[PDB]
Amino acid sequence: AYVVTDNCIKCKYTDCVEVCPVDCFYEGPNFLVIHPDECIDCALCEPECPAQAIFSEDEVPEDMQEFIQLNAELAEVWPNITEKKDPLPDAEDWDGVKGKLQHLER
Numbered sequence: 001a002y003v004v005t006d007n008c009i010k011c012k013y014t015d016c017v018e019v020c021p022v023d024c025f026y027e028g029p030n031f032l033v034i035h036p037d038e039c040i041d042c043a044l045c046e047p048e049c050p051a052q053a054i055f056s057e058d059e060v061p062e063d064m065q066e067f068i069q070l071n072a073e074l075a076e077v078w079p080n081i082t083e084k085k086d087p088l089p090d091a092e093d094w095d096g097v098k099g100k101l102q103h104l105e106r
């Protein structure tokens with residue numbers, strides 16, 4: 001599985017969903033997650049993220065390990081997203097800010 005980590009929060013560019021062959025992104029108010037059962041690990045999404053927030057599960061930084069289980073839990077509750085949409089309004093003010101998990105919305 002590929003994992004969305006911290007920098008997606010409050011950026012949510014959605015560029016990643018275009019390239020996904022299996023449509024395994026689920027949508028929340030200010031973050032996207034990849035559903036781990038569904039991902040086929042084709043890695044096509046991780047060059048597409050402008051926030052460079054996607055990682056192979058096995059490459060998630062040490063300090064972002066929480067995101068692996070978080071993607072798995074929220075994918076079960078959040079709706080499937082299959083079409084790109086516009087980035088959140090202030091997405092590049094927040095792009096690159098560390099510690100955005102305190103801002104996540106369910």
Ligand code: SF4
Nearest residue numbers: 020039040042043045
């Ligand atoms: S690695 Fe592939 S299947 Fe997995 S979310 Fe990314 S683009 Fe979709």
Ligand code: F3S
Nearest residue numbers: 008013014015016049
């Ligand atoms: S910011 Fe998020 S919505 Fe996709 S393109 Fe990057 S993982």
